[PDB]
């Protein structure tokens, strides 16, 4: 009855109520620390990194340095961004998993005020980081496939839609995974599960993608998305 | 003999001969009268309608009115336009049906000079208005669907071609129905009928679409699209 | 002697050195709190806002509520975004201003390690906030002008360049004022004085804007722009 | 007095009152007849025209006919439009002029119910047809100029604004003329009269442009623009 | 182990070795002689073609010849180019096959080098020219179709990819045909063959497409494509 | 005298068509042939290597970037190869154009309707005419890079497209109308002043010359036509100093 994007909205509701409300701070804080620590580092090495990527040129081709400069400078940033993002989700991987349990007990009425402890969090770290690596393995190859498909002057027009649709579906697997993996469910079994809910989890993943495009709101958005995903897992069925 | 778009042309021929020659003036004359009557009222009401759609705003945001004015003024115009066409087509519905019948008797040779009588027209009105409503009910949801699909950044590129192709298929169903409905044929039965004749009525629909973009020529073109569709019905199966 | 976009570069150096590094953490924490506070506010009021703007309609026009809904949701979003920006800048105004003085004493050689104190910061707040209000009062009119010029289908092509040319100039008056305002210097007087350094401060503002197009940069760049602007005030004319 | 375009708006008020707008239905009904005639004609001869325009080609180049077919067809269509747009406006020239007088007596209070008689219309025809022909002469060179400039890849960017600004300015000279021409004023004297105040005509013609973009509303926007122009002639 | 676009590279290698390096010169010589004569021809007759294709208009409509001018000029140019491109490749058709055979024997170790003889080339000419005429018969209708498809306002977006995919596929059928036609390969069986090998021959055809986008490098790239197509024929 | 505008290029094509000047049309093509035939092989063998030079060395983790970085440098390299080639070819065409311009002049002035080609005087021209094309490049490439950097700015590109076009036309005037002018020991600055006084005429000439040189197979006939047309522009409009 709740199928579609409605879950996301409801997930936000689940985050606003006390005792789950303070867990919302986790992603931002991660990205905060990771930013502040890394930013300074990046600041010092930015100049050096481009100097490594740029080839040595003779005096006659030295003019190419003017055209090649903006490139690697862009590329470095593109790397520094992606690298950071890559780490952020990794450090955010356990917390989200830990959250997906704590949301669930509230969804079913078991304990409306779940408690945070580092013990069970550190105990979750390996399966949930490894699971973040499985997600990365499922995503990144297909991403490079669609992107190289888009670099072709003829074929990009079919790549833009495939890109979008895939990114939505990935919003389904990324977040609905957290309760599925917390129920020790196989990767294949969960992807088949989402394949059976493809319309529902495509709507959920879709509005999740959209609301996750808002830059500052990303950080309040993700916890809502996790909780909404847990709700998805409870309202669709955890039989597998 | 004629398969493909050729029917439209032949429809023109049929409308050129005496006795069917004046009905070409029915659509044009309708849109004249309709406009002449409505324009007046519209002029007075237009100003008010936008003020209604425009939100009531506080002092600091009042500058937004300067930017919201064009949008709402645009929107109302669009609505004011569609309504017009929507009403016009409705009023054009029976006259078309009455033509598709009267063209048919000429195509099959029963009466070389059919007469116009308001009696059987008014007798037609409720059913034919009902069918134009069934057509709008078929079209408007799929149209909206395509449009929402166009506002999606990734999927818009797949939205344009689908819009064209559907608008063509719709040109088949709008006009080939007039004789089919005159023959008391089920809606789904005609849609499957045309789905088996996909190519033929997709060609007829195609040229009918193109020619009916030409702005004022529409009102002379349409009766040709009717007669042409009656020909599509006569020269191809009347079987049910 | 020392000139061009290099100021920004040099300004960055001043921020990295022992004694001036932690001041960069002042705006971020603010933007954190300001975000954390406002975002929750937005979360709760969002419905009421989009419902306020939306007009009350009769039953048959109720379908319009579907087209007006995304619109207002966007509009509200934009307000929420711009309002945030507007507030953020304002709160950033004194921390910027307070910095422009503290950078200065480091540039001159009195004290290599300045200390932060809430007393004189709070003593600065009203003057500097009123200052940046003078800035918004100088900027927002010319901005609205160029924007009404760009809405005209014909003139919009000359609006894009005219936009950029002003945006670079603005970069000068925003930052270079911070030390000047600490020296009790008049608004129109500073406008006249910088009207002479137009080229230098336009290079400063040029690299300032471009370098401000990157997201990572901004959080570390505004301090670099403030320090570089202080440096610009010291090595060139402080005369009055 | 009335800043920017209010004249058009005020002009529309004038047209909506009974007595000043049955006059609107006159040229429209004619252009209807014109429309019906020209369309039927083109129906009969469209094939003759495209076969005339198409060159005779060999069997190896016969497939070229397949690319030439859409072309002349387009071309014929275009001519057919412009001819009509040209003729209709031509036929519209006197009625508008005849209206511009009949508007003025209502503006100044002379006669609240103007009388329509074919006599004084036919008497206007030569002067007002000549006058609209002068307007076509002022317009077409600068229009072709901007179109050719707009074909240029680099300079096309300067052709789009110059197009709009001209298309707006022209809306002044056509309409604000109808009263001036009724006052027996020289062409050059009127262009100096309009260039005397650029902003005013620029707003009047500006909204008149935008409002003449609305598809069926043209038919009511034009009369408004005439009377507003009459109003524009009287108040200033 | 060698599948994919690598064949292109390898074909290049085969053409670098002595005795096969003389085979590179002929397509260049064809484009050269043919080009020089046909271009001198083009300059004198151009005026007659554009004047021939352009229709007779009355003197009022005379101005239309100004818009039709850039068009027909363009059109003639396109014909001029296509005709050249049409003829050019025809004359290269047998030299290709005659080359293809001489490459195959090098792949299997049969021949270190063969002295060219006009005899066997002339013996090939009618069959292989009939073969490339059949290639034109497969190609040109799909192209005109895709072009009419690109004229459609909605479907033009689906025309852009459809072109490329076919342009690549054609580059498979064009070159991999030449060894096939050396073996009297029946038309249906080769098209099915390349349809069963879609990935390999489509990558081969792909790099062939792209490297053939390079203008003067076309001339050295085509022999590499022929050699690569023979290797594609032998190893799979 | 009445011949002002872009008509010069047409008339120049006419001059190249009459006997005595007709085979000089083959001077550019042959050049572009030879320069290609010599270079082509070299380039191919070393193309693979050049991209590998410009491409950065990346670790195990950043190796995937090679999939996106590869096509880039390959294009970049190609571009350079093209520009450099077109650079070099134009240099070799510099004396021939000048020589042709000189020879065209005697046909235009009715002195010798069938001028003879001799390697003596062409080789005599080489140093002057090359140096003068180096000056042409010096006038062009800085201003061109300026327009390109200006087009890189997000706000100002819209003003970079027209400026680019107009400057390209103007450079057509400078390049071709210079050829007769250099033959009469005319200074660089003073010819820029003279063309600046003929800006309407030579800007039309440079306009059609530009367009005709955009068509690839046609440009081989048009380049001589542009030289001759430029000689006629020099003859019919003051060659005075
Ligand atoms: C756009 C730049 C945003 C701030 C982060 C990178 C700033 C790098 O800045 C530079 O760092 C170099 C060492 O890496 C020093 O040599 C320079 O003096 C310093 O200006
Ligand atoms: C403000 C920054 C917004 C960028 C949002 C882009 C969303 C990309 O998508 C994400 O890429 C990540 C790796 O980078 C993976 O961890 C995720 O599984 C994948 O969904
Ligand atoms: C991660 C933050 C996600 C916010 C997703 C919000 C989805 C909101 O959903 C909207 O909220 C309103 C609630 O009153 C409803 O009236 C609307 O009909 C509903 O679409
Ligand atoms: C474009 C001109 C449209 C004409 C407006 C309507 C018909 C003439 O206008 C008015 O219409 C009224 C009813 O609306 C009639 O009662 C009046 O007799 C009338 O003059
Ligand atoms: C273009 C000039 C005006 C076109 C018609 C204006 C409509 C006039 O007004 C309309 O008709 C009656 C008066 O005529 C009024 O009483 C009606 O209330 C109004 O709807
Ligand atoms: C869809 C047709 C509407 C576009 C034409 C112009 C509408 C402008 O409507 C304005 O409303 C005013 C309010 O009374 C009236 O004085 C006039 O009707 C007019 O000035
Ligand atoms: C293109 C930029 C804005 C053009 C001017 C918009 C003026 C908006 O002003 C509007 O005028 C209307 C009456 O004329 C009123 O109904 C509105 O309430 C008022 O906001
Ligand atoms: C596209 C048209 C915009 C929708 C708004 C239509 C007007 C809705 O507003 C309506 O206006 C009427 C007349 O003023 C009033 O009688 C009604 O009380 C009011 O509901
Ligand atoms: C004042 C009444 C509201 C505005 C009327 C909009 C009527 C538009 O009507 C449409 O105009 C098209 C051209 O635009 C024609 O091609 C169509 O045949 C016609 O249905
Ligand atoms: C940019 C900030 C986006 C805010 C999206 C907020 C959507 C959630 O909204 C919140 O949840 C309720 C539903 O339970 C809504 O009715 C109210 O807006 C609010 O309480
Ligand atoms: C097609 C564009 C329609 C815009 C309609 C604007 C008319 C709004 O309404 C009118 O605005 C006038 C100002 O011109 C005022 O003088 C009138 O009192 C007012 O009724
Ligand atoms: C095809 C039908 C054409 C209709 C043309 C209507 C001509 C207008 O008719 C005029 O109307 C005036 C009041 O408006 C009266 O004052 C005039 O005496 C009358 O001639
Ligand atoms: C369908 C609604 C009425 C149809 C009749 C309109 C006849 C056209 O009318 C004419 O059209 C020309 C070009 O659009 C205009 O320039 C003329 O002023 C106009 O009189
Ligand atoms: C450029 C192709 C040929 C010209 C086509 C446009 C013909 C119609 O053009 C219009 O006719 C009116 C007559 O009054 C003029 O006043 C208008 O300004 C003019 O645009
Ligand atoms: C083959 C014949 C094609 C000629 C069709 C006549 C088109 C006249 O159509 C007119 O176009 C105008 C815009 O220019 C619209 O604003 C008018 O409402 C409409 O009447
Ligand atoms: C249609 C009349 C002009 C000829 C159009 C085709 C242009 C050239 O077409 C080419 O022909 C070559 C062989 O000639 C083939 O190798 C290519 O696959 C093909 O693209
Ligand atoms: C209306 C007829 C349209 C025919 C267009 C076909 C023109 C041939 O297009 C061909 O495509 C090849 C790659 O695909 C290129 O290598 C050739 O240069 C080329 O001329
Ligand atoms: C690179 C080698 C140059 C050969 C190309 C043409 C140069 C010679 O050109 C020829 O010179 C003859 C007399 O010498 C003239 O009579 C010919 O008309 C002329 O065409
Ligand atoms: C960004 C668009 C690039 C188009 C292709 C390269 C155009 C510039 O090309 C250059 O023009 C110069 C001036 O005459 C010549 O000196 C150079 O030889 C030539 O390479
Ligand atoms: C050494 C291999 C590099 C290849 C560079 C060749 C680029 C050739 O360039 C082409 O040459 C023709 C004249 O020669 C011109 O007609 C074309 O405009 C041009 O694109």
Numbering used by the authors:
A (entry chain E), B (entry chain F), C (entry chain D): 3 to 242
D (entry chain A), E (entry chain B): 3 to 238
F (entry chain C): 2 to 242
Q: Can I see the authors' text?
A:
Third, we determined the structure of PdCysZ, which crystallized in multiple forms belonging to space groups P63, P4122 and P212121, revealing the same architecture and oligomeric assembly each time. We focused our analysis on the best of these (3.4 Å resolution in P63). The location of the selenium sites was obtained from a SeMet SAD data set, and the structure was solved by combining the resulting SAD phases with those from a molecular replacement solution obtained by positioning the PfCysZ model (75% sequence identity) onto SeMet fiducials in the initial electron density map. The refined structure of PdCysZ comprises an entire hexamer of near-perfect D3 symmetry. Antiparallel pairs of protomers arrange together as a trimer of dimers, with the three-fold axis oriented perpendicular to the plane of the putative membrane and three two-fold axes between dimers of the hexamer. Both the periplasmic and cytoplasmic faces of the hexamer are essentially identical by symmetry, resulting in a dual-topology assembly for PdCysZ. The hexamer has a triangular face of equal sides measuring approximately 75 Å, with the perpendicular span of about 65 Å. A surface electrostatic representation reveals a hydrophobic belt along the mid-section of the hexamer when viewed from its side, outlining the orientation of CysZ in the lipid bilayer. In the structure of PdCysZ, the entrance of the putative pore appears to be closed by the network of charge-interactions by conserved residues, R110, E106, N184, H185 and W235. Following this polar environment, the putative pathway widens even further leading into a large, primarily hydrophobic, internal cavity encapsulated by the TM helices of the PdCysZ hexamer, located in the plane of the lipid bilayer.
